[PDB]
């Protein structure tokens, strides 16, 4: 049963979320890495709006954002996926398909799981509330490396879990599998994070440079 406090919290989260494309290969890469920077900036802005987040130590904020950023970017990307054209649209105007990503020099091993995830997420047909809560739940993962106040992180995570459960019970009143199905996507996101670290590793083999913000959160 969705409480007034939960309703108000979810609505607030939803409300909080409301180089040119043409070496030539590396102009595409610069365009994409620049869009990724925009996503990371938005992730940080949203995190700061999450109840409980700014009360964690700044070090715990950084610990959580360092490793959740790729997962939240993947969630945000899934949300922008167009099943009919099999494309993903960034900043409302920039639409891209698998070939576009390959042309930027990204590996097939990276591209294909992200498209497969995006397609599986699309079948779920999550709305803005469900995406917002799942992003919150991904951010408040107590098992991230270097988290100090694991108890508080876990406590926070559970309040978002409980809100998602109650919300989904109104959105999907005859399908009790929707709630766990959503949660189970967080499992796929963990595997995808390791696919991502493999792409980051390959970029440095190729002497392909991540811009400073991206390098800071992802380079070893």
């Amino acid at each position: 049963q969705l409480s007034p406090e939960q309703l108000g919290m979810i609505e607030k989260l939803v409300a909080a979320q409301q180089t040119p494309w043409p070496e030539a290969r590396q102009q595409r890469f610069a365009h994409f890495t620049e869009l990724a920077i925009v996503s990371v900036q938005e992730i940080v802005d949203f995190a700061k709006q999450l109840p409980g987040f700014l009360q964690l130590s700044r070090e715990d904020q950084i610990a959580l954002l360092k490793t959740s950023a790729i997962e939240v970017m993947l969630l945000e990307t899934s949300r922008r996926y167009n099943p009919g054209s099999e494309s993903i649209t960034f900043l409302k105007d920039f639409s891209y398909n698998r070939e576009d990503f390959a042309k930027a020099g990204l590996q097939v091993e990276f591209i294909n799981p992200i498209f497969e995830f995006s397609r599986a997420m699309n079948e779920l047909q999550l709305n803005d509330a469900e995406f917002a809560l799942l992003i919150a739940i991904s951010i408040f993962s107590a098992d991230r490396p270097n988290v100090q106040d694991q108890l508080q992180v876990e406590r926070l995570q559970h309040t978002y879990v409980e809100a998602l459960h109650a919300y989904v019970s109104i959105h999907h009143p005859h399908d009790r599998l929707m709630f766990p199905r959503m949660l189970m996507k967080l499992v796929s996101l963990r595997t995808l994070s390791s696919v991502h670290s493999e792409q980051v590793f390959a970029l440095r083999l190729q002497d392909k440079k991540l811009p400073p913000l991206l390098s800071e959160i992802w380079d070893v």
Binding site: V44, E59, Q61, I217
Partner: peptide
Amino acid sequence: SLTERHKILHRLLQE
């Protein structure tokens, strides 16, 4: 610390 090694993220958080 993580903080000292993540200047840009730290600045974004401080804003």
